[PDB]
Design a protein around this ligand. Structure first.
Ligand code: GDP
Ligand code: MG
Length: 164
């Protein structure tokens, strides 16, 4: 069993918890306590490898250690929250600085894609992710669209960066 240490970051309210809980429990939780920061484990087979994902859902001693030793990052904004998208810069800078590197496994996630009349269009997100050299994936924690894709792609990005 190979462990992968994953960190979910982004502005409060974007769906970091709802995404994590979909991955772990396959349901959509409407109002998960926005103050709870914790780690979760999930056993999953990805490309014939049995993975034990160690995931921090950020909301701290524990956060500092996951930032320092985390292998990959899901940087989440919501497609109907322009501010959360603009804030991605701050999260990306935080990660670059803890790892002293521009080359960190990361996926840009645009969540809440089930909601109408987005204020962040897909091209804007593609543009930002292209500048950072990382994938962009749309998700809905409500419908589960893209949830497995976002996490599996992050695991693949970690492999692309380092032997595991
Ligand atoms: N419609 C929709 N609502 C969502 C989605 N993800 C999260 N939410 C809602 O957005 C709010 C914040 O979600 P939450 O997971 O707590 O965000 P966190 O602070 O980033 O962990 C809650 O009301 C969730 O039900 C989604 O993909 N679609
Ligand atoms: Mg949360």
């Amino acid at each position: 069993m190979t462990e992968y240490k994953l960190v979910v970051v982004g502005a409060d309210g974007v769906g970091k918890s709802a995404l994590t809980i979909q991955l772990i429990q396959n349901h959509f939780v409407d109002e998960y306590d926005p103050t709870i920061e914790d780690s979760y484990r999930k056993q999953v087979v990805i490309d014939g490898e049995t993975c034990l994902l160690d995931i921090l859902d950020t909301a701290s001693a524990m956060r500092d250690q996951y930032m320092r030793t985390g292998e990959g990052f899901l940087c989440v904004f919501a497609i109907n929250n322009t501010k959360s998208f603009e804030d991605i810069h701050h999260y990306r800078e935080q990660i670059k600085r803890v790892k002293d590197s521009e080359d960190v496994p990361m996926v840009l996630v645009g969540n809440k894609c089930d909601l109408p009349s987005r204020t962040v269009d897909t091209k804007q997100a593609q543009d930002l992710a292209r500048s950072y050299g990382i994938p962009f994936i749309e998700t809905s924690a409500k419908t589960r669209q893209g949830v497995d894709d976002a996490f599996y792609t992050l695991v693949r990005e970690i492999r692309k960066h380092k032997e595991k």
